[PDB]
Amino acid sequence: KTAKVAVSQIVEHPALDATRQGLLDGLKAKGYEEGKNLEFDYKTAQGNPAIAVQIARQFVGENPDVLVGIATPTAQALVSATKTIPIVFTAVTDPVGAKLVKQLEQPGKNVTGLSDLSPVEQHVELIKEILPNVKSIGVVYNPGEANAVSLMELLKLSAAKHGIKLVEATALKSADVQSATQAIAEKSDVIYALIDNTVASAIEGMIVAANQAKTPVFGAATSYVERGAIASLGFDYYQIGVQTADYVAAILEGKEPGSLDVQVAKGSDLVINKTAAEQLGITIPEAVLARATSTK
Amino acid sequence: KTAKVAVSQIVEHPALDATRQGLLDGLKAKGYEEGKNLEFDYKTAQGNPAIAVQIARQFVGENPDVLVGIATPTAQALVSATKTIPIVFTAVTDPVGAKLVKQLEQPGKNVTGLSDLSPVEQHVELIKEILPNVKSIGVVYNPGEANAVSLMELLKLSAAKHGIKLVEATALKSADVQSATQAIAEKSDVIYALIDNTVASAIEGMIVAANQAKTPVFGAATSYVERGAIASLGFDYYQIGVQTADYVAAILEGKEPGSLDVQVAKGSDLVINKTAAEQLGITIPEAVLARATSTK
Ligand SMILES: N[C@@H](Cc1ccccc1)C(=O)O
Ligand SMILES: N[C@@H](Cc1ccccc1)C(=O)O
Ligand SMILES: [Zn+2]
Ligand SMILES: [Zn+2]
Numbered sequence: 001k002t003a004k005v006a007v008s009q010i011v012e013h014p015a016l017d018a019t020r021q022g023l024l025d026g027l028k029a030k031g032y033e034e035g036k037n038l039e040f041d042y043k044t045a046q047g048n049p050a051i052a053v054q055i056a057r058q059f060v061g062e063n064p065d066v067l068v069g070i071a072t073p074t075a076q077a078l079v080s081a082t083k084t085i086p087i088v089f090t091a092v093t094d095p096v097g098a099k100l101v102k103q104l105e106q107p108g109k110n111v112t113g114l115s116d117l118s119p120v121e122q123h124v125e126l127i128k129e130i131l132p133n134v135k136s137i138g139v140v141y142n143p144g145e146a147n148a149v150s151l152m153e154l155l156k157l158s159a160a161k162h163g164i165k166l167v168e169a170t171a172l173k174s175a176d177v178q179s180a181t182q183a184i185a186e187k188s189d190v191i192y193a194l195i196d197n198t199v200a201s202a203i204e205g206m207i208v209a210a211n212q213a214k215t216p217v218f219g220a221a222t223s224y225v226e227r228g229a230i231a232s233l234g235f236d237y238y239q240i241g242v243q244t245a246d247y248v249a250a251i252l253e254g255k256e257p258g259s260l261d262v263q264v265a266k267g268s269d270l271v272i273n274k275t276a277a278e279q280l281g282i283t284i285p286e287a288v289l290a291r292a293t294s295t296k
Numbered sequence: 297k298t299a300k301v302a303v304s305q306i307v308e309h310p311a312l313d314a315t316r317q318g319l320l321d322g323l324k325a326k327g328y329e330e331g332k333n334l335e336f337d338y339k340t341a342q343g344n345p346a347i348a349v350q351i352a353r354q355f356v357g358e359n360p361d362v363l364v365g366i367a368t369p370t371a372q373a374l375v376s377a378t379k380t381i382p383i384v385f386t387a388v389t390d391p392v393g394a395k396l397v398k399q400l401e402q403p404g405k406n407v408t409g410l411s412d413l414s415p416v417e418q419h420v421e422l423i424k425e426i427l428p429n430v431k432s433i434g435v436v437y438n439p440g441e442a443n444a445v446s447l448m449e450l451l452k453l454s455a456a457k458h459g460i461k462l463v464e465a466t467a468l469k470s471a472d473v474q475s476a477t478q479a480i481a482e483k484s485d486v487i488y489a490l491i492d493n494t495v496a497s498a499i500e501g502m503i504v505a506a507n508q509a510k511t512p513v514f515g516a517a518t519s520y521v522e523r524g525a526i527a528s529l530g531f532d533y534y535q536i537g538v539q540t541a542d543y544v545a546a547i548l549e550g551k552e553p554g555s556l557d558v559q560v561a562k563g564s565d566l567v568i569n570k571t572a573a574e575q576l577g578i579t580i581p582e583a584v585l586a587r588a589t590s591t592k
């Protein structure tokens with residue numbers, strides 16, 4: 001009679017924390033309240049792929065009604081640890097590429113949820129609009145994250161389509177992100193800070209290195225503009241969490257997760273960091289400043 | 297390796313919520329953190345003695361490392377539901393009278409914790425100091441709460457010692473507290489709002505009735521002065537929660553709960569509500585206003 005929802009999250013960074021808060025508030029609006037009829041357990045893997053596996057195993061052994069995997073690596077560990085307990089993943093960039101589901105329509109097993117697939121093409125076109133003389137896009141990513149790998153395939157096709165050279169470096173853990181940024185910032189006209197958990201957890205260090213090379217950072221997430229990216233075009237992760245509660249409630253009420261289609265997030269907010277831009281000697285064009293849903 | 301602490305609370309009122317927050321923060325300072333190595337589950341009985349029993353049974357069936365009973369009725373249900381899982385009670389007025397322990401020194405079974413036994417004698421002497429012409433003390437209490445019963449025995453001895461008549465009414469649930477207050481407020485020079493969960497959860501209604509009879513309320517808890525009691529001499533429930541974490545951590549580290557002495561809270565803060573007092577046409581004496589650790 002108490003619903004038991006167990007939430008595993010690869011690391012605490014603001015986007016994933018907003019997703020988790022959104023889930024909690026959305027469950028409340030559906031009549032599931034902590035303290036009354038909802039036990040909401042939560043573990044962070046602290047960026048460790050190993051802890052992600054241990055969390056999945058511990059949670060599976062406590063027989064929750066629904067498992068929630070926030071971000072790709074923790075979702076992946078859940079899919080490995082159970083084939084029968086419903087899994088709702090959330091804020092996962094490319095669930096097919098991550099092997100969480102065979103396809104988005106009618107996934108058909110114990111797994112379903114929500115994708116935050118970035119519109120990479122739109123981000124490149126936006127970088128070109130803000131910075132019309134871009135020849136070069138720098139990017140740091142973690143090849144251990146299937147989300148980053150899927151995004152790099154989209155970025156490589158879109159860079160080539162627009163005649164833009166990609167300058168790449170990998171970072172295997174968040175403490176290498178600043179060095180990786182430093183290695184590439186002077187060969188790049190702009191750094192694309194993508195939807196990668198390792199980047200997200202070290203975004204301050206990325207920005208310190210970029211600022212030192214006087215290279216702007218364009219963010220795929222709003223949390224990045226908050227820390228000094230000049231602009232971003234990201235989703236609202238709190239609302240994605242709120243929509244995640246729809247899946248969890250439907251499952252708790254007896255729906256099979258495999259019968260629920262995977263939803264892809266839509267509508268990103270254009271945000272501009274005027275201060276950061278001016279410190280870099282950058283003038284954000286008028287047509288862009290006019291569309292800015294927000295403007296710090 | 298994850299500590300599992302399950303917390304049962306009779307009802308959400310501010311004192312018990314502060315105790316619970318204190319417990320959580322104290323566990324953090326001891327190295328037990330939610331999301332990492334601490335699963336902290338929480339249920340409120342919503343004032344229902346029956347739900348208290350159901351919570352105890354559900355929690356016992358989930359094999360937590362330590363059960364925490366905040367307030368007497370939920371502690372009592374835990375003691376009934378398990379004889380072997382460690383129970384740490386907290387904010388319990390009189391654990392011997394409540395049958396949680398045989399005695400405070402070396403309780404010797406699966407139960408230990410912290411008492412918030414009110415210094416009733418000191419409260420009467422304080423009521424007489426603030427209001428030197430008191431002949432009559434009104435009190436509303438719930439005879440289903442062993443804490444209230446223990447406190448009434450102390451109040452009856454102290455009223456008689458000081459030549460003060462007690463005017464009493466019972467309230468079986470919080471929705472009767474306002475009517476009970478109304479029934480007695482005109483025969484009372486002051487209402488003593490005691491350490492009772494039913495009173496605490498209906499303190500606004502008590503104060504509405506008292507204010508209507510132009511009768512002051514003296515509070516045994518600071519949360520009561522916040523809502524319009526003229527004065528209070530209560531414990532700091534956040535710190536009691538912090539000290540509760542000492543017991544929980546010691547148990548988690550292999551101490552037997554029965555080998556831990558029950559601690560009695562000490563040091564109450566004198567707080568005065570000047571606004572409320574003046575609306576009642578009351579002048580709080582100088583010697584008292586001088587000792588007031590706080591003064592809204
Ligand atoms: N979409 C990412 C999570 C993420 C969200 C927001 C910013 C950065 C990372 C994943 O698939 O794991
Ligand atoms: N001491 C009370 C709890 C309580 C604390 C503070 C105010 C009112 C009630 C009990 O034994 O249940
Ligand atoms: Zn550069
Ligand atoms: Zn469909």
Ligand SMILES: [Zn+2]
Pocket residue numbers: 039040041335336337
């Ligand atoms: Zn739990």
Ligand SMILES: [Zn+2]
Pocket residue numbers: 481482483484485486509510511512
């Ligand atoms: Zn009166």
Ligand SMILES: [Zn+2]
Pocket residue numbers: 401402557
């Ligand atoms: Zn002793």
